[PDB]
Amino acid sequence: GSCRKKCFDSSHRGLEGCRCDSGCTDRGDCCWDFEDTCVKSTQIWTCNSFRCGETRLEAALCSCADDCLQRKDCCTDYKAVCQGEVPWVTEACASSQEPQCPEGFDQPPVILFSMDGWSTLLPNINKLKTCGLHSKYMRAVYPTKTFPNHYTIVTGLYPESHGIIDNNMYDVYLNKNFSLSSVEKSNPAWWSGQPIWLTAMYQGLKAASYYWPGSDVAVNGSFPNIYRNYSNSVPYESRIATLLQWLDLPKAERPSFYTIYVEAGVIKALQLVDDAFGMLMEGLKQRNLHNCVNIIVLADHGMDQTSCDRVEYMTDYFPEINFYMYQGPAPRIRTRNIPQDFFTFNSEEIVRDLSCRKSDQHFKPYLTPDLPKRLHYAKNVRIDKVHLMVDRQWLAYRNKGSMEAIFLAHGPSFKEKTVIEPFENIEVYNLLCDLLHIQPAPNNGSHGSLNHLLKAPFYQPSHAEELSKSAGCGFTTPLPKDSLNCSCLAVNQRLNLNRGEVSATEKTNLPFGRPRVIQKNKDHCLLYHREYVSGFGKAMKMPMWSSYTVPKPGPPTVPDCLRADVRVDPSESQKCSFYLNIDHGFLYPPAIKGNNESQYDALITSNLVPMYKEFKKMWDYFHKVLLIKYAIERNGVNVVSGPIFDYNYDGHFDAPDEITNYVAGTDVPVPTHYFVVLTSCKNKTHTPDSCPGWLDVLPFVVPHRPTNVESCPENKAEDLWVEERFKAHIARVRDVELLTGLDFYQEKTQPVSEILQLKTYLPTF
């Protein structure tokens, strides 16, 4: 009596002879349900009253026919609409402590989903935040652009190592230009590293991708098992349908890993992605995979903070511009005559000619090795030596003419209804390998940092083993053999600590244990003093590390007083005669703790470090003024200071053969940087030496430069720029560990996963 199961027929059988052929419309003969059962049905992605139980239509997008579940072509809403099942979205939160996977699903699939652009508007994505796990903000690496950041996510590498350093670049060795508009975007030579899809493939699993930076590229001569060449033409429902077809594949061909990228009427648009998301969840429920699949969603909440009013122009700084400039928020300057003049180009002159030019200046030029070490944006030919650090909300241009994502995770392997602390996206790749049970390729994340996101972590982190044992530097005589051309016109026994006195300074000044030398054949020895403990590097004739616990405060430094260390061989120690531009500085501030005689333990050749006159200014101000301010704020603080040698700017400590500059006429190396790690306690009620809970860290990797041009100190007193400079060079503990070859807190009564959490936390400013 209607169009049901009779769509396009010579049948006159109807209500009062109503028809169901395509000509019924113009005749007015259609049965009331014609359009819905026969016409709109072939063009929607959802079942309804008319479609439930329909006779299969070939022209149709999905199916609502009785055999659609067996045929695997139902619409996502089939079970809820046609079988009255409670949809995933309305259904209560899942408690699954183990993956409830269908037969064949040996290991739960991983879906990495990225979106861009409260709750009642987006119900599906909200249910995920609600039931699952979400991170406040997910820290993006420099430059903070989407395209490189997406490749970092899947590779675990910093842009300098994976190759995609910006959307636009020129490699001199290729003599090729990369841009997203170019065919060169597809050239595999640009793409370094090993993306998660390859890792899974190389390790037996199969991987698919419905768009993601580099998934439509034969990276290391291979594409993912299933991939789609980038195009914004395809509707979201068709993408989600394909994603589900891939999961409907036979075990043999069926991928274990999936990547899917998606990019007032803003809400209308967002709702379309939430609907597509809800389609994916419904599809999974209908497959019994909703409590099997581990799904991660990244929602870039980043906004364009730029304005045409907040733009800096190079025309204001140069009378003539003959250089090429990569414009915008992370600018880079190069020669126009490429490749010919690429390495000859005076990059140093450009930084100089742009340095402290205006008082209001909304950018700071840098040579890539002088850039803040935390950024890891220097070790690649693609990264031009000239780099401009533009202020937030500002842009820099030739002439007149940023990712911040919310990490969401749902699935049986993930912790339920948990808010997790912000982390860097470099960490994610190991998590992906753990979720997939594969071995991660060498990356920059620290394995086990994100174990707190997992119900049952696949990888259990372990403390790095020391490769060099401390040796020598025992107290033999209280009088030194060689004077070392040193002078103190005004004791050495105070350097002779007994087993009990040693244990006392170890308890107080090495509360989390001593840093471990993760360096092969590095000749060192520890020196024990009442107020401090240093780790003395014999070949460099200076201490690699120095440890001390400054207690909460309630005194000048002893002048013209210096003497040889009676424990350290003259062959292995610095002489006063080496100095006379670059002068000796105290790694450990002598006046920080104790009385006038406590200072004598610090007025020795073992506490001397080579410093530029201008650096010493900053160094001394921090130790005389800023440190005491912090020690009050934090109720004591454990300070670890030390030299850093990273001449090839690869973010690791230098091998001896890598150090290029020394103190004139000597073999004492000039540190490229200095580090200061402020380890105090989170619960301020306890001092750092007596803390049971978590520690609060504050690490600095400050460049050891001969002039303070960076700080632009022009007449200003230290109270105006030194702190600003120190804060400008903040970095993770792990950043230090890498640059030094030392390993911190190997004696803190917490699991390695938890310390790895702290060693990756970057302080916010």
Ligand X SMILES: *[C@@H]1O[C@H](CO)[C@@H](O[C@@H]2O[C@H](CO)[C@@H](O)[C@H](O)[C@H]2NC(C)=O)[C@H](O)[C@H]1NC(C)=O
Ligand Y SMILES: *[C@@H]1O[C@H](CO)[C@@H](O)[C@H](O)[C@H]1NC(C)=O
Mapped onto helix, strand or coil, the DSSP state of residue 74 is: strand
Span from 3-11, 440-448, 603-611, 750-758 in contact with ligand X (CB under 6 A): 440-448
Q: Which one of the listed residues 37, 46, 146, 549 is annotated catalytic?
A: 146
Among 220, 340, 485, 661, binds ligand Y (CB under 6 A): 220
> Residue 324: which of ligand Y, ligand X, Ca ion, none does it interact with, CB under 5 to 8 A by kind?
ligand X
CA 602 to chain centre: 38
Q: Which residues contact 201 (CB under 8 A, 6 or more apart)?
A: 207, 222, 224, 225
Q: Which residues contact 196 (CB under 8 A, 6 or more apart)?
A: 112, 154, 155, 207, 257, 259, 429, 432, 433, 436
Site string for ligand Y, 168-207 (x = CB under 6 A): --------------------------x---x---------
φ and ψ of 332, to 5 deg: -140, 140
| Residues 231-245 as b or e (16 or more Cβ within 10 Å = b) | eeeeebbebbbebbe
φ and ψ of 97, to 5 deg: -75, -10
Mapped onto helix, strand or coil, the DSSP state of residue 266 is: helix
Q: How far apart are CA 445 and CA 448, in angstroms?
A: 9
Among 231, 685, 749, 764, binds ligand Y (CB under 6 A): 685
Under the binding rule (CB under 6 A), the answer on residue 398 touching ligand X is: no
Number of residues that bind Ca ion (CB under 5 A): 5
Q: Which residues are annotated as a binding site for ATP?
A: 145, 167, 216, 230
> Residue 738: which of ligand X, ligand Y, Ca ion, none does it interact with, CB under 5 to 8 A by kind?
ligand X
- ∠ CA 47-53-56, nearest 5°, is 85
For residue 226, the cross-strand partners are: 208
> Residue 610: which of Ca ion, ligand X, ligand Y, none does it interact with, CB under 5 to 8 A by kind?
none
Under the binding rule (CB under 5 A), the answer on residue 654 touching Ca ion is: yes
Two tokens, residue 173: 């060795």
SS3 content of the chain, % helix, strand, coil (to 5): 30, 20, 55
Residue type, 244: L
Query: Closer CB to ligand X, residue 195 or residue 480?
Result: 195
Q: How far apart are CA 84 and CA 15, in angstroms?
A: 29
Query: Closer CB to ligand X, residue 326 or residue 612?
Result: 326
Mapped onto helix, strand or coil, the DSSP state of residue 168 is: coil
Q: How far apart are CA 756 and CA 334, in angstroms?
A: 39
Under the binding rule (CB under 5 A), the answer on residue 652 touching Ca ion is: yes
Residues 437-466 that bind ligand Y (CB under 6 A): 441
Residues 628-687 that bind ligand X (CB under 6 A): 650-652
| Residues 195-211 as b or e (16 or more Cβ within 10 Å = b) | bbbbbbbeeebbbbbbb
Under the binding rule (CB under 6 A), the answer on residue 690 touching ligand Y is: no
Span from 76-84, 176-184, 222-230, 401-409 in contact with ligand Y (CB under 6 A): 222-230
> Residue 229: which of ligand X, ligand Y, Ca ion, none does it interact with, CB under 5 to 8 A by kind?
ligand Y
Under the binding rule (CB under 6 A), the answer on residue 376 touching ligand X is: yes
> Residue 175: which of ligand X, ligand Y, Ca ion, none does it interact with, CB under 5 to 8 A by kind?
ligand X
Span from 112-120, 335-343, 604-612, 657-665 in contact with ligand X (CB under 6 A): 335-343
Query: Closer CB to ligand X, residue 177 or residue 487?
Result: 177
For residue 135, the cross-strand partners are: 407, 420
The residue count for the chain: 765
> Residue 176: which of Ca ion, ligand Y, ligand X, none does it interact with, CB under 5 to 8 A by kind?
ligand X
Do the Cβ atoms of 292 and 101 come closer than 8 Å?
A: yes
Q: Which residues are annotated as a binding site for Ca(2+)?
A: 646, 648, 650, 652, 654
Span from 229-237, 442-450, 592-600, 680-688 in contact with ligand X (CB under 6 A): 442-450
Query: Closer CB to Ca ion, residue 326 or residue 653?
Result: 653
**In the bound complex, what is the minimum distance in angstroms from residue 468's beta carbon to ligand Y?**
30
Q: Which residues are annotated as a binding site?
A: 116, 145-146, 167, 216, 230, 300-301, 646, 648, 650, 652, 654
Neighbouring C-beta atoms of residue 581, cutoff 10 Å: 10
For residue 702, the cross-strand partners are: 674
Query: Closer CB to ligand Y, residue 229 or residue 477?
Result: 229
CA 14 to chain centre: 66
Do the Cβ atoms of 5 and 55 come closer than 8 Å?
A: yes
Mapped onto helix, strand or coil, the DSSP state of residue 696 is: strand
Among 42, 487, 660, 683, binds ligand Y (CB under 6 A): 683
**In the bound complex, what is the minimum distance in angstroms from residue 452's beta carbon to ligand Y?**
16
**In the bound complex, what is the minimum distance in angstroms from residue 296's beta carbon to Ca ion?**
34
Site string for Ca ion, 599-638 (x = CB under 5 A): ----------------------------------------
Among 21, 77, 282, 646, binds Ca ion (CB under 5 A): 646
> Residue 553: which of Ca ion, ligand Y, ligand X, none does it interact with, CB under 5 to 8 A by kind?
none
Under the binding rule (CB under 6 A), the answer on residue 229 touching ligand Y is: yes
Mapped onto helix, strand or coil, the DSSP state of residue 296 is: strand
> Residue 388: which of ligand Y, ligand X, Ca ion, none does it interact with, CB under 5 to 8 A by kind?
none
Query: Closer CB to ligand X, residue 576 or residue 742?
Result: 742
Q: Which residues are annotated as a binding site for Zn(2+)?
A: 116, 146, 300-301
DSSP assignments along 6-38, one per residue: -SS-S---SSSS-B-STTHHHHT-B-TTHIIII
Q: Which residues contact 134 (CB under 8 A, 6 or more apart)?
A: 406, 407, 408, 409, 418, 419, 420
**In the bound complex, what is the minimum distance in angstroms from residue 90's beta carbon to ligand Y?**
37
Q: How far apart are CA 203 and CA 739, in angstroms?
A: 32
**In the bound complex, what is the minimum distance in angstroms from residue 194's beta carbon to ligand Y?**
4
Q: Which residues contact 207 (CB under 8 A, 6 or more apart)?
A: 196, 197, 198, 200, 201, 224, 225, 226, 255, 256, 257, 258, 259
Among 140, 550, 738, 758, binds ligand X (CB under 6 A): 738
**In the bound complex, what is the minimum distance in angstroms from residue 332's beta carbon to ligand X?**
13
Neighbouring C-beta atoms of residue 366, cutoff 10 Å: 22
Under the binding rule (CB under 5 A), the answer on residue 735 touching Ca ion is: no
For residue 561, the cross-strand partners are: 488
- Confirm whether 146 is a catalytic residue: yes
> Residue 600: which of Ca ion, ligand X, ligand Y, none does it interact with, CB under 5 to 8 A by kind?
none
Q: How far apart are CA 206 and CA 369, in angstroms?
A: 40
Among 256, 444, 546, 680, binds ligand X (CB under 6 A): 444
Q: After which residues is the chain broken (C to N over 2.5 A)?
A: 117, 263, 401, 490, 554, 580
**In the bound complex, what is the minimum distance in angstroms from residue 506's beta carbon to ligand Y?**
24
Q: State the helix-helix crossing angle for 123-131 and 265-285, rounded to 10 degrees.
A: 60
Under the binding rule (CB under 5 A), the answer on residue 650 touching Ca ion is: yes
Mapped onto helix, strand or coil, the DSSP state of residue 115 is: strand
**In the bound complex, what is the minimum distance in angstroms from residue 60's beta carbon to ligand X?**
48
**In the bound complex, what is the minimum distance in angstroms from residue 732's beta carbon to ligand X?**
11
Instruction: Give catalytic residues, as residue numbers.
Output: 146
Q: Which residues bind ligand X (CB under 6 A)?
A: 157-158, 161, 170, 175-177, 193, 324, 336-338, 376, 442-444, 650-652, 738
Q: Which residues bind ligand Y (CB under 6 A)?
A: 194, 198, 220, 227-229, 441, 683, 685, 693
